[PDB]
């Protein structure tokens, strides 16, 4: 149901979506590897996902999500 | 069909749920007044008049005097113990008599009559 949740997110409503008038949409989700709303970068509509985030200590981690 | 002044005679029904609440509270008031009694009276089974509805039956107005006498319920006691009486209806056949007599003895089998004092 990756495709169905993608259709619901992309075509109806997503709380992490920033719609700009300049030709690009942005993803407000913290686990998005690129802050852009597209099919490949969605942390929710992709069951297997991976991102890179930096802690307040300065240590950088890789986050992996499985189905 | 708007030839007449229909503007002055439009009836809306925004008070439908409020009237349903009013009807339910009226039934509750009837229950409060008649506390162990049912809020309804017992009514007979009658056949629908026309040939179109002859196959089905419905509830009548009140039991015939012959039906009450055959069931063993006196005429004057019957309205005071929850049974409706209709003096206009006639039986005309041995099959409505038996059905409503069975209904009356079934009502008698499940009745808790209290003494006067």
């Amino acid at each position: 149901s990756d495709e169905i949740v993608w259709q619901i997110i992309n075509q109806q409503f997503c709380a992490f979506k920033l719609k700009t008038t300049k030709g690009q949409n942005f993803c407000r989700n913290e686990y998005s590897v690129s802050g852009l709303c597209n099919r490949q970068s969605c942390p929710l509509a992709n069951s297997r996902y991976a991102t890179v985030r930096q802690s307040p200590k300065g240590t950088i981690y890789l986050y992996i999500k499985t189905i | 069909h708007f030839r007449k002044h229909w503007q002055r005679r439009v009836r809306c029904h925004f008070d439908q749920p409020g009237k349903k609440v009013t009807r339910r509270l009226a039934r509750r008031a009837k229950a409060a007044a008649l506390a162990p009694r049912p809020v309804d009276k017992l009514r007979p089974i009658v056949r629908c008049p026309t040939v179109k509805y002859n196959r089905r039956t419905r509830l009548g107005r009140g039991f015939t005097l012959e039906e009450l006498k055959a069931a063993g319920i006196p005429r004057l006691l019957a309205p005071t113990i929850g049974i409706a009486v209709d003096h206009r209806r006639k039986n005309l056949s041995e099959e409505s008599l038996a059905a409503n007599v069975q209904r009356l003895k079934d009502y008698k089998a499940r009745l808790i009559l209290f003494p006067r004092k």
Partner: protein
């Protein structure tokens, strides 16, 4: 000048009349002399007017109580001593008259009253 109400309730008719007379005379004199240099006379005039109102109320109440004591067993009372209600409430049937029934109805209700019963499920 200022008189409380219960003290007036204790006294009788001729007494209440003589305080009424002296209060009226004081009010008349103060109204005559109040046209020049009205200082603290205004509050006293207002208090005296309220005092006359209180005395008149007490005498009226005592007189109407005595009149009601007179008419305790008499059939007709004066219209001032009758309850007002409304015009329609004064014209409706009395409780004794409206609750009256015929003898046939009374016999039927006596021997065949509405009974208490319960249909068990």
């Amino acid at each position: 000048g200022k008189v409380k109400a219960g003290q007036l309730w204790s006294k009788n008719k001729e007494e209440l009349t003589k305080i009424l007379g002296e209060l009226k005379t004081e009010l008349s004199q103060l109204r005559i002399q109040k046209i020049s240099s009205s200082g603290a006379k205004l509050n006293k005039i207002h208090d005296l007017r309220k005092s006359i109102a209180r005395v008149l109320t007490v005498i009226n109440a005592k007189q109407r109580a005595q009149l009601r004591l007179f008419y305790k067993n008499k059939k007709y009372l004066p219209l001032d001593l009758r309850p007002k209600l409304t015009r329609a409430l004064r014209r409706r049937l009395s409780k004794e008259d409206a609750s009256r029934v015929l003898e046939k109805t009374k016999k039927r209700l006596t021997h065949f009253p509405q009974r208490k019963y319960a249909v068990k499920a």
